[PDB]
């Protein structure tokens, strides 16, 4: 019966806005208060406000004043959420729920929307270079967020190529390792660039391995 | 800014144990004959659940096992009993006040259930003995874990490769199993010794506990 | 196509006779003779002898004549092995075999009867009697082969019975024991009868328990 | 009674690889042209196979990988390759006279597939020094099986806490795996040594391998 949906999880660049839907359902809309609540990773409950959808009247807790903008739209049983100037500290999942009003109460909530702000970062693409079969590389170093994919002489080269999983560093980017092994008679003759792709930041880098002077 | 202070931050509870929460207000709560006290149970990667709203009102499809409290400034959610289903951090929060203010959470971690075994030994049946061999039994009832570390000792004296033991399957509801070892002898080797034992070790038992019985 | 068929694992008594079926199928069968093999657990093949299904014609190995017996039925497309005077020496998979003739080969194989000859034997039951809730049970000990049934005073008494699984013992017989918890005051009124129910030897054992005088 | 002596008893092969058994027989089988020699494959708890009758006429739908031999008293079957689904004993049997005998068997076991890692050592790319940061990059290529102990040792120092490390899900054909170690330093960290190297220890070498470069 009674559903709040909200959107599912957000990537959004720092000093931008977010608008967040609540799909109300199985219940008046118009006759109860809708409350909004943040909650960053494995840390607690912090009240933005609520907002009367009769009236579209709404409060707010100071330390969100001019940061959020609760919306609704009476036509479309929704209510809205947008946050501004987004900065890191705004990394959390956010709620909706339906306010019972008479003890205040956050009755039923949103399964919450995850809203991450930081930077999305193509990778800098640093070539492997054999030195003696043989094996060689390119390094896909500091990107943001996954996923990236690599291709080897755009893709006409696929066998002994292992493209590892990808590894979070401290910096909170990803880097990766593609290696493929080759005859290294054919290192004097055969153009090895491997292209890499981000759909996320719409890169493609491609980069030549040539043998060390 | 009502500050709700929960108390505790963290505790550990078993299955079948009462638990009590309590939220601490730095101002009363108490506003036209009732308290705008309300809790939230949040289970990991789920969003919060509402268990009880104004210090007392249980929620619609929240078992009685969860009860409300108090006024003034002393809250009280109970859990009673205590199940599996209740790993989760709870929240007090009022509004009596705008802003609508959240305790800081009370982390509730069900604790792994540990049944130490009822240990029993038993005597050869004179209709055995009469038969030539005596078979000693030592029952491990009802133990969780499986680990369990047990030892026939005859006379103060580590038998070895004399016993055979069998186990129960995993017990459905209590997940708990049995051991039976049964120590076999000569009706020659059982009029030899005294005081036939059983060293039983277990997480559940505080020191190891040794069944004994006396005229072998 | 070809299938030879052979009856299932077949338990029997010393001093006794089993005949041993071999359904022949997808193939003339009365064209190719059948060869009979003996198998001992984890060691080799031992040619036991074949029968010509056309004259029923039999050639038997020496150690074996007096032994088997290899009969046919041209009618029901089936070879048979009776085996006599059966001993411990005569457990093994027996397997018949189609023979292609022309290099004596046993072309298709037979899944194999597994045939086990030693004594079914009913359980002695001792009583595990209590002195101080406390438990008490009933050791079963001495039987082949399983599976043997435990009820408590005729399957009235359910709660607090844990009959445990069969343990092989070097005699090669079985042993489990059922074991009660109860109330140690019912000690003095109830009576605690173990029942012992073991289809193989069309034994019903009851015992009594009662503490130690 | 002809006696047939297999040889070997049990031999343990790696697919890849050509296995031979060998049946010798107390007396000629040679009769009227062929040699009336068979064998047989009996996969554990399943009845016995024919590969070979007549000691070179493979049977229906056995692989080529099984071929026959020879005559008199000297005969030999072979796998060529040897794949994991070769794992049987091997029963050799005559059919030359009364009784039809049996060799001894000769147990197959398939050995554990063992791939040493293929070691490559990476030197960080000038266009990544003038951006101000080292990372070296040790490759240990289609390993089997998964345990395999590598280090980081910097003119002759281990190096700790600096290094991590991917692992590609297990090969579906050849079951292997491949392991990248990104050992990262600062441009100052890298022109202050000369030798970085990388030891890697795995069943499949003998000796520990480390591969080095010079030129930090």
């Known amino acids: 019966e009674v559903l709040l949906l909200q959107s599912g999880p957000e990537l959004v660049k720092p000093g931008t806005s977010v608008k967040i839907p609540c799909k109300a359902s199985?219940?008046?809309?118009?006759?109860?208060?809708v409350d909004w609540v943040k909650q960053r990773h494995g840390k607690g409950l912090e009240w933005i406000g609520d907002?009367?959808?009769?009236?579209?009247?709404?409060i707010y807790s100071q330390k969100f004043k001019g940061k959020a903008t609760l919306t609704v739209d009476k036509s479309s049983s929704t209510a809205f959420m947008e946050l501004r100037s987004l900065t890191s500290e705004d990394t959390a999942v956010y709620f909706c729920?339906?306010?019972?009003?008479?003890?205040?109460?956050?009755?039923?909530w949103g399964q919450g929307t995850s809203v991450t702000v930081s930077s999305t970062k193509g990778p800098s693409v640093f070539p492997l270079a054999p030195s003696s079969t043989a094996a060689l590389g390119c390094l896909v170093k500091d990107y943001f967020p996954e996923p990236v994919t690599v291709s080897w002489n755009s893709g006409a080269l696929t066998s002994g190529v292992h493209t590892f999983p990808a590894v979070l560093q401290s910096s909170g980017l990803y880097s990766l390792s593609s290696v493929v092994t080759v005859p290294s008679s054919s290192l004097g003759t055969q153009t090895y660039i491997c292209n890499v792709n981000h759909k996320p930041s719409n890169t493609k880098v491609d980069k030549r391995v040539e043998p060390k002077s | 800014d009502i500050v709700l202070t929960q108390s505790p931050a963290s505790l550990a509870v078993s299955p079948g144990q009462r638990a009590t929460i309590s939220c601490k207000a730095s101002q009363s709560l108490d506003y036209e004959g009732d308290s705008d006290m309300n809790w939230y149970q949040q289970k990991p990667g789920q969003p919060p659940r509402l268990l009880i709203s104004g210090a007392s009102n249980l929620e619609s499809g929240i078992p009685a096992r969860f009860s409300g409290s108090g006024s003034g400034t002393d809250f009280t959610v109970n859990i009673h009993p205590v199940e599996e289903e209740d790993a989760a951090t709870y929240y007090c929060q009022q509004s009596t006040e705008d802003p609508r203010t959240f305790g800081g959470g009370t982390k509730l971690e069900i604790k792994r259930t540990v049944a130490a075994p009822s240990v029993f030994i038993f005597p050869p049946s004179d209709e055995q003995l009469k038969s030539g061999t005596a078979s000693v039994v030592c029952l491990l009832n009802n133990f969780y874990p499986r680990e369990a570390k047990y030892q026939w000792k005859v006379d103060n004296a580590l038998q070895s490769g004399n016993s055979q033991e069998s186990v129960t399957e995993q017990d459905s509801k209590d997940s708990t199993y049995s051991l039976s070892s049964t120590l076999t002898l000569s009706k020659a080797d059982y009029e030899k010794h005294k005081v036939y034992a059983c060293e039983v070790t277990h997480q559940g038992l505080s020191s190891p506990v040794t069944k004994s019985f006396n005229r072998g | 196509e070809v299938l030879l068929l052979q009856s299932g694992p077949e338990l029997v008594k010393p001093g006794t006779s089993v005949k041993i079926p071999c359904?022949?199928?997808?193939?003339?069968?009365?064209?190719?003779?059948?060869?009979?093999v003996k198998q001992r657990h984890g060691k080799g093949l031992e040619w036991?002898?074949?029968?010509?299904?056309?004259?029923?014609?039999?050639?038997?190995?020496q150690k074996f004549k007096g032994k088997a017996t290899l009969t046919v039925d041209k009618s029901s497309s089936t070879a048979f092995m009776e085996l006599r005077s059966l001993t411990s020496e005569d457990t093994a998979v027996?397997?018949?075999?189609?023979?292609?003739?022309?290099?004596?080969?046993?072309?298709?194989?037979?899944?194999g009867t597994s045939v086990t000859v030693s004594s079914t034997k009913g359980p002695s039951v001792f009583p595990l009697a209590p002195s101080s809730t406390a438990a008490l049970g009933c050791l079963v000990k001495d039987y082949f082969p399983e599976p043997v049934t435990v009820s408590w005073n005729s399957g009235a008494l359910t709660s607090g019975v844990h009959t445990f699984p069969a343990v092989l013992q070097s005699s090669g017989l079985y042993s489990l024991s059922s074991v009660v918890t109860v109330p140690s005051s019912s000690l003095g009124t109830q009576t605690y009868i173990c029942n012992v129910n073991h289809k193989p030897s069309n034994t019903k054992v009851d015992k009594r328990v009662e503490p130690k005088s | 009674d002809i006696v047939l002596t297999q040889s070997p008893a049990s031999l343990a092969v790696s697919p890849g690889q050509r296995a031979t058994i060998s049946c010798k027989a107390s007396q000629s089988l040679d009769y009227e042209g062929d040699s009336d020699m068979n064998w047989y494959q009996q996969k554990p708890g399943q009845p016995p196979r024919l590969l070979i009758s007549g000691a070179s006429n493979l049977e229906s739908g056995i692989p080529a990988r099984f071929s026959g031999s020879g005559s008199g008293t000297d005969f030999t079957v072979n796998i060529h390759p040897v794949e994991e689904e070769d794992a049987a004993t091997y029963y050799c049997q005559q059919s030359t006279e009364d009784p039809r005998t049996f060799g001894g068997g000769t147990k197959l076991e398939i050995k554990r597939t063992v791939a040493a890692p293929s070691v490559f050592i990476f030197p960080p790319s000038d266009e990544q020094l003038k951006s101000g940061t080292a990372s070296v990059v040790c490759l240990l290529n289609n390993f089997y099986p998964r345990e395999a102990k590598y280090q980081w040792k910097v003119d002759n120092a281990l190096q700790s806490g600096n290094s991590q490390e991917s692992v590609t899900e297990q090969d579906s054909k050849d079951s292997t795996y491949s392991l990248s170690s990104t050992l990262t330093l600062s441009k100052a960290d890298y022109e202050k040594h000369k030798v970085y190297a990388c030891e890697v220890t795995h069943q499949g070498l003998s000796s520990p391998v480390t591969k080095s470069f010079n030129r930090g």
């Open positions: 729920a339906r306010n019972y009003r008479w003890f205040g109460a956050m009755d039923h």
């Open positions: 199985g219940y008046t809309f118009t006759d109860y208060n």
């Open positions: 907002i009367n959808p009769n009236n579209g009247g709404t």
